Amino acid sequence: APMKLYGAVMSWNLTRCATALEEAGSDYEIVPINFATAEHKSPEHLVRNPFGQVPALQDGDLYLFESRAICKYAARKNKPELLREGNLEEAAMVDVWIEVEANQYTAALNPILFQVLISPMLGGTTDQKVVDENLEKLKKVLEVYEARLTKCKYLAGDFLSLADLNHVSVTLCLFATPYASVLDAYPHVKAWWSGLMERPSVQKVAALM
Amino acid sequence: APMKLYGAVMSWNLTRCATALEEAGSDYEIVPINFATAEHKSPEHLVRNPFGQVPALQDGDLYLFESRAICKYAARKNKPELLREGNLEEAAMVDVWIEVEANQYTAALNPILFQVLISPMLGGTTDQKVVDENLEKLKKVLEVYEARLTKCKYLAGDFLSLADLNHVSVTLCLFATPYASVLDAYPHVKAWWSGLMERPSVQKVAALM
């Protein structure tokens, strides 16, 4: 009955899946994968993800991988309204913004979250060089989000969709560091992020970390 | 009035859309964008793509950007069979592989295409180091594609889907480098490519280049 989500809760890619599963109201549980013992590279795991990585989802005998693919499925199966399937124009927007998150927002955030967050916990120091330039890249993205959110309640339009939830796992991480002050320069992105932060699904996900 | 695909035929992100538009029998028209004139950063283009990039698609009054989203749109609008909409398990399978193209296949192929094809065109030289390194990363993906293609007729199952088509533009470019031979060690992957190559849709985009 419950779908098994494979991966350690410390990965923001698995929590991207947890966000959608929590919102669609899916029956699921997490199964941690230890990287220390190369568990992700075991034969049992390779039948779930041939590329040997997490996340991986199992629904009965159905195996899925790639966080964003796992996300569309949980909505597609439990809360399709998050995909606006049925309305062509609306569904097109959700896709447009699901791609922007991956190719724009997160792409600028990734270098940052590592320097400011992962690197130090592994015993390293933060490279300001990298942080500074990526903050510029992200800055230009937030200006667009700012205009977008001035005209629309949410990213895909006046409704919540997968485009929105897909941004929480990385943003929650950003919000745990002193760089959360970059959102203050964009009132609408800020308001938007607060609205999302109220949702129980988001609070649970934040709790998983 | 035909759809408008904005951008130069030269970019494979642009032609990725053409492949989808072609196969869906979409009535479209290519509208070049000259970067030399910062035309992509013109206020006119900024209405089509807030990020000032190509491709951008116009359908009457609808405006879409980000290639893989434009692709889903044309398929959903003119050929929903490519998405396998009505089958939860099949649609999920399509999504998984649409991500694999972007996150594994083209992730390894892009660096090589820039070095071998773009760099020299601009007036530079190919850095073999990055060609060999990414060539290694690619083989690891190919051996998994090989395994998949033995079990299934196509990537998402025994049916052609957008997942397959989305690999057209970049692979087409690979077949324009001395590296097109890598596929020879991967029989099912090679057969799969040859099967696709015989479609008029891929023959039309190849012509566009």
UniProtKB/Swiss-Prot annotation, chains A, B:
GO terms for biological process: glutathione metabolic process; response to herbicide; response to hydrogen peroxide; response to reactive oxygen species; response to salicylic acid; response to xenobiotic stimulus. Residues 87-209 form the GST C-terminal domain. GO terms for cellular component: cytoplasm; protein-containing complex. Residues 1-82 form the GST N-terminal domain. It comes from the Eukaryota. It catalyses: RX + glutathione = an S-substituted glutathione + a halide anion + H(+). Expressed in the stem and leaves, lower levels are seen in the pollen and endosperm. Its EC number is 2.5.1.18. Keywords: Transferase. Glutathione binds at residues 11, 40-41, 53-54, 66-67. Conjugation of reduced glutathione to a wide number of exogenous and endogenous hydrophobic electrophiles. Involved in the detoxification of certain herbicides. Homodimer or heterodimer of GST-I and GST-IV (=GST-II). Belongs to the GST superfamily. Phi family. This is Glutathione S-transferase 1. It comes from Zea mays. The lineage of its organism: Eukaryota, Viridiplantae, Streptophyta, Embryophyta, Tracheophyta.
